[PDB]
Amino acid sequence: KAFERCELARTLKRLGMDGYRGISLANWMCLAKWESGYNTRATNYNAGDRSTDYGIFQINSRYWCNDGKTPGAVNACHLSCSALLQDNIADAVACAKRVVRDPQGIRAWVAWRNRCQNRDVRQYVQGCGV
């Protein structure tokens, strides 16, 4: 599913992401925008280390979800990576909450540091009613 900007903003708000572990909704929006363009079926295989990024938040198979073909993988979210490809993002959000509970927080995604950190991220939620 390809989410519309404001549709996603309201959905994440309802799922309790606004201010989760100190992370504002606009930051989560900036993350999803740059990671997948708000698309839930987005996947990216990393030939270099044999892992794959799944879904709207592009969660990696080495630490977070199990896809069976990633060497030395752990499944911290206790989810099949398949779960991160659903139209309903409830599982993806539960796993993203798990990711940020680690010391790095939102910094775990390098794309966040490149395109969101120290930037005006208000634009991602403007006019959405959140």
Side-chain angles (χ1 to χ4, degrees), residues 7 9 12-13 28 31 40 60 82 85 92 95 99-100 117 120:
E7 176 189 8
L12 295 180
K13 183 137 204 292
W28 288 113
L31 176 70
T40 67
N60 192 270
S82 180
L85 300 177
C95 189
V99 176
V100 302
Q117 173 176 202
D120 217 4

Side-chain angles (χ1 to χ4, degrees), residues 84-95:
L84 309 179
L85 300 177
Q86 302 174 82
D87 276 2
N88 180 276
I89 68 179
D91 290 316
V93 161
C95 189

Side-chain angles (χ1 to χ4, degrees), residues 48-129:
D49 85 324
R50 307 187 147 172
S51 72
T52 305
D53 303 317
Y54 294 94
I56 206 160
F57 294 127
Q58 285 291 269
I59 291 172
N60 192 270
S61 61
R62 185 160 299 285
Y63 325 98
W64 316 110
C65 63
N66 181 42
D67 68 2
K69 56 174 176 54
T70 301
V74 281
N75 184 3
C77 295
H78 294 84
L79 282 175
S80 159
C81 295
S82 180
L84 309 179
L85 300 177
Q86 302 174 82
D87 276 2
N88 180 276
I89 68 179
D91 290 316
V93 161
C95 189
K97 281 182 190 181
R98 173 60 182 87
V99 176
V100 302
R101 229 174 286 149
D102 270 10
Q104 279 194 281
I106 189 75
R107 281 156 170 80
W109 284 273
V110 186
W112 183 79
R113 291 116 72 121
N114 301 342
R115 16 263 315 196
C116 307
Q117 173 176 202
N118 297 164
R119 304 195 190 238
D120 217 4
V121 294
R122 284 176 178 71
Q123 61 168 317
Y124 300 103
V125 300
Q126 291 318 267
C128 302

